[PDB]
Design a protein around this nucleic acid. Sequence first.
DNA 1: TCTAGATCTAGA
DNA 2: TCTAGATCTAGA
Length: 251
Amino acid sequence: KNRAFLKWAGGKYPLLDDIKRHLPKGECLVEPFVGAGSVFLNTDFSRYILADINSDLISLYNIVKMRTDEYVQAARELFVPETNCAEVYYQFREEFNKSQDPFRRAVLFLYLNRYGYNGLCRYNLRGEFNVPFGRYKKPYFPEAELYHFAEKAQNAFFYCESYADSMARADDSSVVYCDPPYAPLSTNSFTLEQQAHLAEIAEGLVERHIPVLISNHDTMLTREWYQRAKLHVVKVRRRKKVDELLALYKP
DNA sequence: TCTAGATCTAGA
DNA sequence: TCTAGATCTAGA
Ligand SMILES: Nc1ncnc2c1ncn2[C@@H]1O[C@H](C[C@@H](N)CC[C@H](N)C(=O)O)[C@@H](O)[C@H]1O
């Protein structure tokens, strides 16, 4: 099992067993919500189309892929004992938000992700990263995970676009895995309309003989959205207990 | 999961 | 010129 080099919300590292068994085979894997890319790092497709709405994330991935050794050496400088304090963190955060250089931003982005509070990724409406200091004892520099990512990235294209645009790139030799933001159990958030729209696009792709796999919480709403797919309940219970749902659209 | 402080939006 | 109610900000 390969780990992502980024802390990221909704990481599918724990559920990789259930995903890979229910994920159809193909020449290309399309991830509209790639995030940290746990599935991409733990599968073996000939090529990938990885997309996300986060421009900083996609920019980082392009840098790591194209300028690997240069990035690792630069990013390694920031993972020293002297940088693990609030005053240094907040200046680096400010440097990140004021930087117009993709490389420097990518370098700082990794630091902020590993030194920031709970590994959060949060922006204000000005597009400024505003996650406070994390106060970790010893942040880990994912050098091994970085090189493995860049190695696998050689067969992947990265795009900063919404799910509708990325799924439109899917061909007949493609498989689509969708990991959208979690549906609510009970602004800027991923809306219920978008949750329903995702299933609708999934219905269109399978009608075009393109396999689509979707993962989400197991709720009454998700069962309604994915009612045209074979439903597979994963028990990772985690005051109520929440199961996960794998919705497969097989042609 | 929170919340004090600042800002937004409408009532013509 | 208010400001209730709802967002937004960011951990200071
Ligand atoms: N409309 C959108 N279109 C495409 N991606 C989005 C959209 N909204 C949110 N996202 C991204 O979808 C991702 C959701 C993550 N939970 C995915 C995690 C990913 N599966 C991983 O293993 O790391 C986030 O990175 C979002 O930035």
